[PDB]
Symmetry: C2
């Protein structure tokens, strides 16, 4: 009989990979230069987005069920590890089957495959439960609503890492100049061929910075969380789902724009995605504040030392996104520059957040 | 001031993603149907393999340094988390710069970029050290050879998950039938279009099973490890590097073969990769046995309860690979069938390993 922590961490990593499988088609969608094709291209992209959102949810539900199952099976053994591997393997087919079901609505085989995968997941989990109850010493002591904060943190960390490294993975695969290309299409200059790839690196820069800072806020919040809840888990799931869309937004804000309005609308979309990703972290914090006695450490309670700093940390990005979005409507001519200035400023504000909070508190105290 | 466990887990996940970036070009290499191109294609593939092996090592070294740095910085704070994010960002560019250096040997800019990335990593880590020494309370208590088993386990888990899900990621991106294709090239049968994708799913099946069982052996070993060492870390790095090549081997053993000798040689390669991945886990165990008093729990000491079972668990796959490799030379006509029978048997042996070990021990006792 063994401790289950490493096995559950491995399962969380696998589930995080599977939950994000359908983002690659979205980011690998090519921004066509011909605007006349837009109507078609958009129709594809939106669909690819919708599927991504559904899959991430469905897998999340499975993950949640897993998190509950092994709250009832505390200690693991060899048989349970092998069975959990089987369960992970079954879960890995959910995205493909759902994608096939949506791609072939009128073919009854797609729904059959998806339902059979769901049934197989259920069967393996029931086998795990039966095995653990046949050997009672593998059950949790209380067996012989809250979600395990451990699993939430691990799953979120995996999702954040994948989303932060998506664009660098794509660059490392696709954008190493061909030695022959550097000759004819760049007159032998590796400098020029690399410079012709600047926009993609700027996109990776922006995406990694934003995802890392959102992870930083999430990490700061869950460092103070005594107990996670189902509502908090749902809000975290929504936040991660919208975090997945940040690399796309940053790709679109570095591409070439024939018309300024395209730049403006891409900025709008980017700010909207950032706001959606961050407002649900803030909602997580606010919902936890409803039951701070049970969910939060005293430090972040109302009147605590770290309450205001935590609120500022979790409300920074939403406020910045809202300000940029409002500028796009009221200060259009400067909106793109404001967006870039925000991309530079927000990391600096996170760096100097404590001093800024103290300064604001003192200023309001004297005022 | 904060506990550093979640930040280090996040860093391990990022580093595991970066260490495996250069495997995607290897697995995305297309098995050409024209044998006359082989000489060229092989030359590419081997090169893509070599780079993958170098990058995985270089990143590993960085990871190792990281693991040491935060053995000296025990507790973290906001500034250190942001600095660690900067360090991760710097590390993410090592694969691209090394690939560019190897792709353009005669251009001095590639070596310059790679060296500058290394220098930037060093600079950020020195900044972390200086900050932690300016605030002594962030240092480890012993500051105010062994590698952290925590980091080794997390890094290995991430690598294993990525390698296990590579092929399903590729399938989910590429191999959902086009609705138009199902019409003309398959006469409207979704069943037939899915069946024409069977080999890839068999490859994923095989790869996931093998990677999961290797992870199972690694997990069983490190459940009994009191202290990890530098030599053990090097052997684990080698094992993970050769684990990365299993999806390729399983792709090659499901592709079409005009000549039986191609099948035989692909089987040889697959068995060799499995043997290389597993023999280093066994070497890890054997090296730990040199200092069991310091590195291992009593259960797995010589004469302990779990010594023989652990040895069998870590020597199963190497023995099976060796047997299949020998069959390919002595029982060529049956070698492919023996390979498939082994792919079925090894999971069953892991499932019934305890009973088989007991049976063998009793049989030798009576004999
Ligand atoms: K973890
Ligand atoms: K992960
Ligand atoms: K990926
Ligand atoms: K971990
Ligand atoms: K991982
Ligand atoms: K991962
Ligand atoms: K990954
Ligand atoms: K990947």
């Amino acid at each position: 009989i063994q401790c289950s922590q490493r096995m559950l961490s491995f399962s969380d990593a696998l589930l995080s990979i599977i939950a994000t499988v359908m983002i690659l088609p979205v980011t690998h969608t090519e921004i066509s230069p011909e605007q006349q094709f837009d109507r078609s291209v958009q129709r594809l992209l939106a669909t690819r987005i919708a599927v991504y959102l559904m899959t991430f949810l469905i897998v999340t539900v499975a993950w949640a069920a897993h998190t509950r199952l092994f709250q009832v099976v505390g200690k693991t053994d060899d048989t349970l590890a092998l069975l959990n591997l089987a369960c992970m393997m079954t879960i890995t087919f959910l995205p493909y089957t759902f994608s096939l079901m949506v791609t072939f609505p009128d073919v009854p085989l797609g729904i059959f495959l998806f339902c059979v995968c769901v049934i197989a997941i259920g069967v393996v989990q029931a086998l795990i439960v039966g095995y653990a109850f046949h050997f009672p010493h593998l059950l949790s002591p209380q067996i012989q609503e809250p979600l395990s904060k451990e699993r939430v943190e691990a799953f979120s960390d995996g999702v954040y890492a994948i989303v932060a490294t998506l664009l660098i993975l794509d660059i490392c695969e696709d954008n190493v100049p061909d030695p022959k290309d550097v000759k004819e299409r760049f007159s032998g200059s590796l400098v020029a061929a690399l410079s012709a790839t600047g926009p993609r690196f700027l996109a990776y820069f922006g995406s990694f910075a934003t995802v890392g800072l959102l992870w930083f806020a999430h990490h700061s919040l869950f460092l103070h969380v005594r107990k996670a809840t189902r509502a908090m888990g749902l809000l975290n799931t929504l936040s991660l789902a919208f975090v997945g869309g940040l690399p796309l937004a940053y790709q679109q804000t570095s591409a070439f724009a024939r018309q300024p309005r395209d730049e403006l609308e891409r900025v709008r979309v980017s700010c909207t995605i950032i706001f959606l990703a961050s407002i649900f972290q803030l909602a997580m914090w606010t919902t936890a504040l409803l039951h701070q006695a049970e969910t939060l450490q005293p430090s972040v309670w109302f009147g605590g030392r770290e309450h205001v700093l935590m609120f500022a940390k979790l409300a920074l990005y939403p406020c910045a996104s809202l300000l940029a979005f409002a500028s796009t409507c009221l200060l259009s001519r400067f909106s793109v520059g404001i967006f870039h200035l925000m991309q530079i400023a927000v990391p600096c504000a996170f760096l100097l957040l404590r001093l800024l909070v103290g300064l604001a508190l003192a200023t309001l105290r004297v005022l």
